Structure 1
Amino acid sequence: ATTTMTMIQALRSAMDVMLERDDNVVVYGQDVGYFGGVFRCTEGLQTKYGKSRVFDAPISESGIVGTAVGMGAYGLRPVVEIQFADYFYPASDQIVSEMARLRYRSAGEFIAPLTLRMPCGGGIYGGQTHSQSPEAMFTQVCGLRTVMPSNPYDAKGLLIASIECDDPVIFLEPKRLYNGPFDGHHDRPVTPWSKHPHSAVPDGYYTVPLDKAAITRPGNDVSVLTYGTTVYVAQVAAEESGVDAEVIDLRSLWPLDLDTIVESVKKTGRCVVVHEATRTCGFGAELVSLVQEHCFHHLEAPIERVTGWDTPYPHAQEWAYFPGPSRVGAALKKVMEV
């Protein structure tokens, strides 16, 4: 059957499905056990499957990822969490130097079928260590697979799919979209998921193929490359600018769906990249570099990108940093200009 869930509830369902589908699936991290997670994403999972399957861990990122790597070497499928993406740094070495290169350097003898869930994104008065977007620290790592959903349905499918993949997967989860969609309007109080599209999630097993982007708003004017919270910001911003922009939610940052992208810009003739992360060397720099390579001639204007400023995430100036429907919309016009 089907039930209406929030992203939190969706992700929880995915783990519940896998924990039940694969005896080798394990879940653990800070406060993930008895408490059920600081975001409720793992509620009751320990009560239902036991301490040996879902449990609390010491405050050590490197230790969490490290033991998980050794666990995978044995033959387990570890789904581990990092309370906030802002706190993945301590696990940098284990992630880059170990998890990613495990299969390569061992010629397949040992593998890292691990999944690391990390809440990310801003727009919640989180501050410097409560709302950054480190996707660019991962996608440049040969051996990793970076994924980020934008709605309940996709959140479950991509997690179940990310979990089963035999490659290490960095599963980014936009905390901003945990309770409901967010377009970037703080004036208009936000609504839940039960009153919006894509909150209908199947109770059992199902997936959402990786390496496959998705068009959110079919358009012919401009190609909009994005993911996460800026997906709903591009949709609304397009409606405000009037621009018949095509909104593309990559879903899979890297590897990504190079065709669905080169195909939308091929038709359109212009694209704009939108992501929360800082600008310089952000993920948006790779998207731009690929578009300019497979769509140089069919390009009818300079490729634009609306992202966060090259500054640490502020608290007070929240709305001045976050690329909202406004600053984004302005971009949808600057590109449609001759």
Structure 2
Amino acid sequence: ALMTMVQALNRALDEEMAKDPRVVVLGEDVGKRGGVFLVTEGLLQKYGPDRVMDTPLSEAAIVGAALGMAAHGLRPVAEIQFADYIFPGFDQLVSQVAKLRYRSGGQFTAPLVVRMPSGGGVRGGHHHSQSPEAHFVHTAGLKVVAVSTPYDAKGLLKAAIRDEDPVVFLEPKRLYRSVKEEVPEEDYTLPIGKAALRREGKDLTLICYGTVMPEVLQAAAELAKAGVSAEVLDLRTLMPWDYEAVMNSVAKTGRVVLVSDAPRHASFVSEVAATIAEDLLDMLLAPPIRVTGFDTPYPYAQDKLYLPTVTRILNAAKRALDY
């Protein structure tokens, strides 16, 4: 059926909860309110307060309790209201969650998922716009996924809930209802760690994910009109990312532009760019170009100037093509 990302995510949660009694949802306002973005709407009414629980306002309590629940027997899907608010519970995430399996020699595990809306373009200012994935990818022990379509949302969230490794699941909020795509009602999952080809091309490779997908796809379309064949690759999983998919595309095109709304310095795309340069120098016809969010806190007034524009992406594509 045709559904928005919110509907797809809600369906994924409903399905997994119907399948496994151990699956529980917890976070601020996820119960009666149905979530500030309605992702958990109706779940409390259907599964009860012992499976959909509103928690006190503490990200440390949310992430840490989820970790404790996961280690003991449940399969919690914790929600952090906005990715910007993961920080108060940062130590729980990086010191307890990420390192549990490793520090215990595999004696204890963390089958939990931490969902969080992310990305700019929604006039959220400093704390309703952040894309902190870099913080997670840099932390060994955490799988990191960022979806951009309703189809991937359901498939990957279901995959994450079944995955025994801790997964930080980012949902670009500007994409929650931006489009209605066909999403099978039947049970299906998608592979974590695999990119998705959105457009095949041979003149340029556009690596991206999450928040910026709309502008990237639009840029690809405009390049086509100008006789330029760009290959668009949605990474989907940031850790572990699809190394093969990335290197195969860049090897074919010889030029690549990486796009993300996350701050430039030590960002995830900086990691992919550095890796491409280190392993495929001989295949590069142009420098790996990065179109990223600026190295500033997310601005309110200039929201639309901070988020990568189709123009900014096209200027980068031109530099790569004209090199």
Partner in structure 2 of residue 204 of structure 1: 186
Task: Tell me the distance in 2 between the aligned counterparts of 1:53 and 1:203.
Answer: 22
Partner in structure 1 of residue 242 of structure 2: 257
Are 1:231 and 2:213 an aligned pair? yes
Letter of the 1:305 partner, please give it.
R
* Aligned partner of residue 153 in structure 2, secondary structure: helix
Deviations 1:267-326 (A, max 9, x none): 111111100001111111100111112211011111100011111111111111110111
Q: CA deviation at 1:100?
A: 0.7
Q: CA deviation at 1:217?
A: 1.3
Q: Given the alignment, which residue of 275, 279, 287 partners 1:290? A: 275
Are 1:299 and 2:284 an aligned pair? yes
Letter of the 1:330 partner, please give it.
N
> For residues 65-214 of structure 1, what are the structure 2 equivalents within 5 Å?
65-180=63-178, 193-194=179-180, 199-214=181-196
Deviations 1:155-191 (A, max 9, x none): 00000001111000000000010011xxxxxxxxxxx
Letter of the 2:156 partner, please give it.
L
Letter of the 2:309 partner, please give it.
G
* Aligned partner of residue 282 in structure 2, secondary structure: coil
Deviations 1:243-289 (A, max 9, x none): 31111000001101100110000111111110000111111110011
Partner in structure 2 of residue 54 of structure 1: 52
Letter of the 1:312 partner, please give it.
P
* Aligned partner of residue 183 in structure 2, secondary structure: strand
Task: Tell me the distance in 1 between the aligned counterparts of 2:160 and 2:277.
Answer: 29
Partner in structure 1 of residue 41 of structure 2: 43
Partner in structure 2 of residue 19 of structure 1: 17
Unaligned runs of 5+ in 2: none
Letter of the 1:70 partner, please give it.
G
Letter of the 1:94 partner, please give it.
Q
Deviations 1:54-94 (A, max 9, x none): 11111000000111111111111110100100000011101
* Aligned partner of residue 283 in structure 2, secondary structure: coil
Partner in structure 1 of residue 301 of structure 2: 316
* Aligned partner of residue 275 in structure 1, secondary structure: strand
Task: Tell me the distance in 1 between the aligned counterparts of 2:140 and 2:313.
Answer: 31
Task: Tell me the distance in 2 between the aligned counterparts of 1:291 and 1:276.
Answer: 20
* Aligned partner of residue 52 in structure 1, secondary structure: coil
Q: CA deviation at 1:225?
A: 0.9
Q: CA deviation at 1:124?
A: 1.1
Task: Tell me the distance in 1 between the aligned counterparts of 2:116 and 2:191.
Answer: 20
Are 1:217 and 2:199 an aligned pair? yes
Query: Is the CA contact (8 Å cut-off) linking 1:226 and 1:273 kept in structure 2?
Result: yes
Q: Which has the higher helix share?
A: 2
Query: Is the CA contact (8 Å cut-off) linking 1:4 and 1:200 kept in structure 2?
Result: yes
Task: Tell me the distance in 1 between the aligned counterparts of 2:106 and 2:52.
Answer: 28
* Aligned partner of residue 262 in structure 2, secondary structure: coil
Partner in structure 2 of residue 183 of structure 1: none
Query: Is the CA contact (8 Å cut-off) linking 1:119 and 1:175 kept in structure 2?
Result: yes
Partner in structure 1 of residue 255 of structure 2: 270
Normalised by the length of structure 1, the TM-score is 0.93
Task: Tell me the distance in 1 between the aligned counterparts of 2:234 and 2:70.
Answer: 31
Deviations 1:5-42 (A, max 9, x none): 10000000000011111111110100001110000000
Matched residues, number: 320
Are 1:248 and 2:233 an aligned pair? yes
